[PDB]
């Protein structure tokens, strides 16, 4: 372990306080790891549920696209790609405190400056296509939220691991090091006090012997 040769007594207090405090910090990191584990677990079940949602959503979007294609006849991809410029639908990163952990969440943003799609030469069926677009708008957007829940879950795992690592360091590492430091310092200090006490005992014995010599001198004077 770790031993320091030169110790006072104040150093023992600083090490003891740092040890108890790191112990409490270990407890805090442990409970935090428990809560983060539960949260990441719920986020995991929600992530699988979100994937199984995602497949159905993809099927639905594909179906909507097919319906629009049947309605239009027209070549959707050309006009669509041509009408892309700036995002009407963007995203916004936000910071949310969640059970202690600060997480980045995504918020859907709808630019009102950008208009909706207006297909020309499609007429009434174009409106049907609009509805199909709505479906996609309703769908993948929620999926993006779920995606956030995924990313935040992943990080929630990584950070949880970090907490666990701290627990690993605050267990057999920091605690044992502080214990060895406190023990060695205690031994050095108690031994030094024992040596000083020996010097004092020898001094008191010297005074007692000198006093006994005084007494012997007094007896000699009396005789």
């Amino acid at each position: 372990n770790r031993e320091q040769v030169f110790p006072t007594r104040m150093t023992l207090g600083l090490m003891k306080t740092k040890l108890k405090g790191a112990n409490q910090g270990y407890s805090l990191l442990k409970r935090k790891s428990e809560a983060l584990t539960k949260r990441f677990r719920d986020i995991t079940k929600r992530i699988d549920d979100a994937k199984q949602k995602m497949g159905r959503v993809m099927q639905t979007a594909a179906f909507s696209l097919a319906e629009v294609s049947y309605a239009t006849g027209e070549n959707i991809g050309y006009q669509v790609q041509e009408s892309v410029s700036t995002a009407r639908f963007k995203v916004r990163a936000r910071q949310e405190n969640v059970s202690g952990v600060y997480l980045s969440q995504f918020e859907s943003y709808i630019d009102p400056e950008i208009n909706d799609f207006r297909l020309t030469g499609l007429g009434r069926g174009g409106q049907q296509v609009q509805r199909a677009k709505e479906i996609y708008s309703r769908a993948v957007e929620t999926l993006v939220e779920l995606a956030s829940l995924q990313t935040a879950f992943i990080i929630l795992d990584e950070v949880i691991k970090v907490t666990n690592r701290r627990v690993n360091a605050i267990e057999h590492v920091i605690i044992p090091r502080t214990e060895n430091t406190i023990a060695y310092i205690n031994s050095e200090l108690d031994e030094l006090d024992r040596e000083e006490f020996y010097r004092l005992k020898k001094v008191q014995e010297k005074k007692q012997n000198e006093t006994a010599k005084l007494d012997a001198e007094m007896k000699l004077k009396r005789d």
Partner: protein, 115 residues
């Protein structure tokens, strides 16, 4: 992270059309680059897929979410599993003629283990 507000997509015809229809597509006028690219299983080479993946994941500071067809994601499952960063978030979704396999998703596979 805060700079990440745009969505990039790599997926088949139907998916690309639907997503672009939703209004998620955007073209940077200055760079003339797009945030959408139609993909074909037969025609698009694996090297271009890996290139696009690496570029969208690391070369751009403005990418928030990368969409990818399950059929497409399977071809680069290695690179997908290799991606461990929280951003961009990884979500495997189905495509036409190619339903969504849960175990195929690299991230979701990673989550599956140790469940």
């Amino acid at each position: 992270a805060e700079k990440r507000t745009l969505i990039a997509v790599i997926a088949d015809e139907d998916t690309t059309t639907g997503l672009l229809l939703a209004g998620i597509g955007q073209i940077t006028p200055e760079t003339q680059e797009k945030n959408f690219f139609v993909y074909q299983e037969g025609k698009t080479t694996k090297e271009e897929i890996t290139d696009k993946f690496n570029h969208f994941t690391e070369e751009r500071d403005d990418i928030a979410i990368l969409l990818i067809n399950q059929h497409i994601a399977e071809n680069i499952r290695a690179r997908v599993d290799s991606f461990t960063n929280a951003f961009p978030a990884i979500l495997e979704i189905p495509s036409k003629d190619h339903p969504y396999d849960p175990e195929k998703d690299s991230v979701l596979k990673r989550v599956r283990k140790l469940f």
